[PDB]
Design a protein around this ligand. Structure first.
Ligand SMILES: [Mg+2]
Ligand SMILES: [Mg+2]
Lengths: 177, 144
């Protein structure tokens, strides 16, 4: 039951460089094994210095500017430690320790950034992941017709769409019972 | 399909076992093995030479940036390779085909079929087992 819950997480960062870039937005949801959303967790924008934001890549600067994320990061007073406190408290109240997997689209990158910057949060979770993008690639290869009809760079919207994408895959390309 | 799409839908299967043994091969979109790559030992050669070997192989086998890494819990292997074989990883897509994801989905949604699924320490045998496991999943829990 609770051991089969999933911890869905999406991150927005200043870039892909794990050695230099930081987390600027994070959202978390808790679903059961049937993808029913059980709990909506914190949706936080994490304060980061102005120099890193002004030094972002062209893709990151353009997109995080058009979405208003850069201005929100400039506006935020939430540190990385406070964000980890909130997320750790949420998952500790929602999941049993060490049994539930991270979930999302290409969530291995999010797992890299969380292992580096939120290690206690990741210590609460299982080591396996549920990568929706794996199912996406398998659907693109084996079910192109269904893939064509499958369903803002902000964390909450992205993770909601990830859950819906996996639900579409289960409804359309997995064996009916 | 259009010319080149079947090649763009190939998979680069890799496995690493800890002295580190590393093996790699290529499958088509239907999991048929097309070519076997190097099977190397790194700390009988150096990391840079082994990276060159694997990169030359995947250059001969997949178009740049289009094909994903594949394997069981391949995210850990990708974490290692992004740091120690970055030129090899730059040839690959950023998405992965994690057989462990399908394994978890089968355990949750198809437990009866899950009890029948396939489950040495050499990397090539691990790749073979991962391919057979994904094929079992396609045969038994995916839409006919
Ligand atoms: Mg995402
Ligand atoms: Mg996003």
């Amino acid at each position: 039951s609770m051991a089969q819950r999933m911890v869905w997480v999406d991150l927005e960062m200043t870039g892909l460089d794990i050695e230099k870039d930081q987390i600027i937005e994070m959202a978390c949801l808790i679903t059961d094994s049937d993808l029913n959303i059980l709990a909506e967790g914190p949706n936080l924008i994490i304060k980061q210095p102005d120099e890193l934001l002004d030094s972002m890549s062209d893709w990151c600067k353009e997109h995080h500017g058009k979405s208003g994320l850069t201005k929100a990061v400039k506006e935020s007073t939430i540190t990385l430690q406070q964000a980890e406190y909130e997320f750790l408290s949420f998952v500790r109240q929602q999941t049993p320790p060490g049994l539930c997997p991270l979930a999302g689209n290409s969530v291995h990158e999010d797992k890299k950034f969380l292992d580096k910057y939120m290690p206690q949060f990741m210590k609460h979770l299982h080591y396996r992941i549920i990568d929706v993008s794996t199912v996406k690639e398998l659907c693109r290869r084996w079910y192109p017709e269904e893939y064509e009809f499958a369903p803002s760079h902000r964390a909450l919207d992205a993770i909601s769409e990830s859950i819906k994408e996996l639900q579409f895959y289960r409804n359309n390309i997995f064996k009916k019972k």
